[PDB]
Amino acid sequence: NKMEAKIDELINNDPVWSSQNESLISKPYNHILLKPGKNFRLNLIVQINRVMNLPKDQLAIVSQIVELLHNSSLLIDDIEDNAPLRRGQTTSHLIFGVPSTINTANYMYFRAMQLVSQLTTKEPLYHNLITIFNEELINLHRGQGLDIYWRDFLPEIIPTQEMYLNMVMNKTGGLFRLTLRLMEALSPSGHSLVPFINLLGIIYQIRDDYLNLKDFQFAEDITEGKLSFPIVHALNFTKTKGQTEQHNEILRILLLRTSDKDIKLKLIQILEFDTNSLAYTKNFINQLVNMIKNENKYLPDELLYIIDHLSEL
Amino acid sequence: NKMEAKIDELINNDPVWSSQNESLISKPYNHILLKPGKNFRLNLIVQINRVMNLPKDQLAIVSQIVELLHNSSLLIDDIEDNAPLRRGQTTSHLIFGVPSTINTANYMYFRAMQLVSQLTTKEPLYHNLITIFNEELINLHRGQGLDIYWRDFLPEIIPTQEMYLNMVMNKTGGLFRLTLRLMEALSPSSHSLVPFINLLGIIYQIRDDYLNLKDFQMSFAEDITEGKLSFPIVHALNFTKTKGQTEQHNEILRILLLRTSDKDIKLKLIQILEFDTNSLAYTKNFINQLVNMIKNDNENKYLPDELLYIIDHLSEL
Ligand SMILES: CCCCCCCCCCCC[P+](C)(C)CC(P(=O)(O)O)P(=O)(O)O
Numbered sequence: 332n333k334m335e336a337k338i339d340e341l342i343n344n345d346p347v348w349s350s351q352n353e354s355l356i357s358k359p360y361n362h363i364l365l366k367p368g369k370n371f372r373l374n375l376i377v378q379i380n381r382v383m384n385l386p387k388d389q390l391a392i393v394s395q396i397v398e399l400l401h402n403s404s405l406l407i408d409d410i411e412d413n414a415p416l417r418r419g420q421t422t423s424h425l426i427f428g429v430p431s432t433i434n435t436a437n438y439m440y441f442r443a444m445q446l447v448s449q450l451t452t453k454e455p456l457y458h459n460l461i462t463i464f465n466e467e468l469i470n471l472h473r474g475q476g477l478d479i480y481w482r483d484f485l486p487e488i489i490p491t492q493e494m495y496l497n498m499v500m501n502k503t504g505g506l507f508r509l510t511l512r513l514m515e516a517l518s519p520s521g522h523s524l525v526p527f528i529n530l531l532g533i534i535y536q537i538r539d540d541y542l543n544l545k546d547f548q549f550a551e552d553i554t555e556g557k558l559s560f561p562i563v564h565a566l567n568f569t570k571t572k573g574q575t576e577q578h579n580e581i582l583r584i585l586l587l588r589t590s591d592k593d594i595k596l597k598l599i600q601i602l603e604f605d606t607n608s609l610a611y612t613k614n615f616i617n618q619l620v621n622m623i624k625n626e627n628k629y630l631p632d633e634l635l636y637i638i639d640h641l642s643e644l
Numbered sequence: 645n646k647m648e649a650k651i652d653e654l655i656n657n658d659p660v661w662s663s664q665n666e667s668l669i670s671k672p673y674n675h676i677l678l679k680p681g682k683n684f685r686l687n688l689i690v691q692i693n694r695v696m697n698l699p700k701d702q703l704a705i706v707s708q709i710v711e712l713l714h715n716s717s718l719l720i721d722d723i724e725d726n727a728p729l730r731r732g733q734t735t736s737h738l739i740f741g742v743p744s745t746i747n748t749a750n751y752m753y754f755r756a757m758q759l760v761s762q763l764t765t766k767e768p769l770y771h772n773l774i775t776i777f778n779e780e781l782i783n784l785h786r787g788q789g790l791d792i793y794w795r796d797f798l799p800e801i802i803p804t805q806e807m808y809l810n811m812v813m814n815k816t817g818g819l820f821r822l823t824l825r826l827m828e829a830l831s832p833s834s835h836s837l838v839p840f841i842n843l844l845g846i847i848y849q850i851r852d853d854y855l856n857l858k859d860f861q862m863s864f865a866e867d868i869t870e871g872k873l874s875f876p877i878v879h880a881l882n883f884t885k886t887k888g889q890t891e892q893h894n895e896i897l898r899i900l901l902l903r904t905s906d907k908d909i910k911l912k913l914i915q916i917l918e919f920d921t922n923s924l925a926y927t928k929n930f931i932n933q934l935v936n937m938i939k940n941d942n943e944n945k946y947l948p949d950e951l952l953y954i955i956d957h958l959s960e961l
C-alpha cells in the first residue's frame with residue numbers, strides 16, 4: 332500500500348523538476364552564450380525602437396526571445412552543418428554531444444515561446460504575437476530545410492539565383508521579420524519596415540556566403556558543400572556557357588566535403604578567374620546596399636553603422 | 645535597374661514557398677508515417693472522448709496534433725539514441741540524413757502549434773490551449789534532456805527509482821497530458837482524468853523498458869547498446885549498490901559503457917539482471933501493481949472495460 336500510495340502522490344502532482352536538473356540540461360546553451368554578438372543584435376533592436384517606441388521593459392522581453400531563438404537556431408545549424416567552430420570556439424555539439432544539444436536547442440524554442448505571454452495581457456494582441464512567432468519559425472524551417480536538402484542531395488537539384496533568394500527570404504529573413512513584426516504589433520506609436528528588414532536579411536546572408544570564401548582567399552562552406560550565393564552563380568554560369576568540365580569539377584569538389592586547403596583554394600580561384608562569381612557577388616552586395624544608401628521608401632546615420640557591422644549579428 | 649526591380653518585388657512580398665518545396669521538406673516525416681501505431685492512438689482518443697464529447701471536427705484536429713508531435717518526437721528520439729530501427733523499419737535519419745530529419749521533425753512541431761489555433765476562435769480558451777501545448781512541450785524536453793544526460797554522463801549520476809519516475813513523468817507523461825488537457829479544456833461537458841493519464845504514461849514507459857530486454861531474453865535489446873538508464877537497469881544498479889555487490893555493480897556499468905551490439909555481451913548483462921538482482925521479475929511485478937491500481941479502481945478514483953484492452957495494448961501506442 333506504500334508503493335500505491337507514492338504512485339498516487341506522483342500522479343496527482345505536477346511533474347517534479349529541480350533547478351539542478353535545469354542547469355544540467357542547459358549546458359549546451361550556456362556554452363554558446365559565451366560567444367560574442369549580443370551587443371550588435373541589441374544595438375539594431377534599439378535603433379529600430381527609435382521608430383517603434385516600445386517601453387524599455389517590453390523591449391527587454393523581445394530581446395530575450397530573440398536571443399533564445401537565435402542561439403538555439405545556431406546550436407541546431409552547427410549540428411546540421413557538422414560545423415567544428417562558431418565565432419572562433421568549439422561548437423557545442425562536439426562537447427556535450429549531438430543528442431543533448433538538439434534537445435536543449437529545441438527546449439529553448441519553447442522557453443522563447445513562453446516569454447511571448449509576458450509581452451501583454453490583451454488577449455487579441457497575444458494571439459497576434461503568437462501567430463507571428465509561429466509563422467516565422469515555420470518560415471525559418473522551410474528555408475533551412477531547402478538549404479540542407481540541396482546540399483545533401485546535390486546534384487539532384489541545382490538551384491538558380493531566384494530559388495536561392497526565395498530560400499534566403501525564408502531561412503534568414505525569418506528572425507529579422509519575427510523581431511520586427513513583434514515590435515510593430517506592440518508599437519504604441521510610416522510604412523511597414525518589413526521590406527527593409529527582408530533586405531537586411533538578404534544582404535546579411537549573401538555577405539556571410541561571400542566572406543566565408545573571401546577571407547580565406549577556412550572556407551568552411553566548401554567543406555560543408557553549401558549551395559552559397561557565389562556557388563549558385565558559378566554552377567549556373569558554367570551550365571549556361573557550356574563549361575562542362577568546370578561545372579562538374581565544382582560539383583565534384585563540393586561532394587568531397589574536403590578540408591584540404593589547396594583543393595578549397597582551387598575552387599575559390601575557379602570562381603575568381605573562370606566564372607567571375609566572386610566579383611559578381613561583391614557587386615550584387617554593393618547593389619543591395621546602395622538600395623538603402625539611395626525616397627525613404629524602404630527606410631523609415633546609425634543605419635550605415637549597422638550595415639557595416641551586419642556580419643557581427 | 646532590372647536587378648533592383650526584381651529585389652523590390654522579392655522584399656515586398658511574403659516568402660515564396662511552393663507545394664513542391666513542401667513535399668521535399670516532408671520526406672523524412674512521410675517515411676515514418678508508413679510505420680504502424682496510428683490506429684491505436686486514435687482508439688485511445690476516441691475512447692477518452694466518450695467522456696469529453698468534443699464535436700468530431702474538433703476531435704480530428706486534436707488527433708492531427710497528437711500525430712504530428714508524436715511522430716516528430718520519434719524522429720528526433722531515434723537521432724538522439726542513434727537507433728537503426730523503429731517498428732522493424734529503417735529509421736528516417738539513416739535514409740534522409742540527420743540534418744534533414746532534425747529540421748523536418750522541428751518543422752512539424754510548429755505545424756502542430758499552428759493546428760492549435762484552429763481548435764477555437766474564443767481568445768480566452770485559445771490562450772489556455774497554447775499554454776497547455778507550451779507547458780507540456782517544455783516538460784517533454786526536460787524529461788528527454790535528463791534521460792539523455794544520465795545516459796551520456798554515466799557513470800557520473802546513477803538515478804534512483806524515485807528520480808527515474810520523475811523523469812518519466814516529464815518525458816512520457818508530456819504527450820499523454822497534453823492530449824488529455826486539450827480535450828478537457830474543449831469539453832462542452834460539465835474529476836479530471838490527468839492522474840489517470842499520468843499512470844498510463846508510467847505504465848507505458850516501464851513496459852517499454854521491460855519489453856526491450858524481455859523480448860531479447862526470449863529470442864535486439866537496443867537499450868543496452870544505447871546505455872539507457874532503463875527501469876530494469878535502474879533497479880539492477882541500485883540493488884547491487886545497496887547489497888554491496890561491488891563487482892556486479894561495476895560489471896553492469898562496464899557493459900553499458902561499451903555501447904555494444906555484441907549479442908553475447910548483451911546476454912551477459914541480462915544474466916546479471918535475471919540471476920543476480922532479479923530485476924526483470926521485479927519489473928514485471930512493478931508494472932502489474934500499477935495496472936492493478938486501475939483494475940481495482942471500483943470507487944472510480946482514477947477511472948471516470950475498453951480500458952482493459954487499451955492498457956494491455958498500451959505498447960502499440
Ligand atoms: C530586426 C532585429 C533583427 C535581429 C537579428 C538577429 C540575428 C539574425 C541572424 C541571422 C542568421 C542567419 P543563419 C543562422 C541562417 C546563417 C548560418 P547558415 O549556415 O544557415 O547560412 P551560418 O553561415 O552562420 O552558419
Ligand SMILES: CCCCCCCCCCCC[P+](C)(C)CC(P(=O)(O)O)P(=O)(O)O
Nearest residue numbers: 685688689721815816819820823824852961
Ligand atoms: C491521451 C491520448 C494520448 C495518445 C498518444 C499517446 C502517445 C504516447 C507516446 C509515448 C512515447 C514515449 P518515448 C518517445 C519517451 C519512448 C522512446 P525513449 O527512447 O525516449 O524511451 P522509445 O523507447 O520508443 O525509443
Ligand SMILES: [Mg+2]
Nearest residue numbers: 408409412414
Ligand atoms: Mg551554418
Ligand SMILES: [Mg+2]
Nearest residue numbers: 721722725727
Ligand atoms: Mg528511444
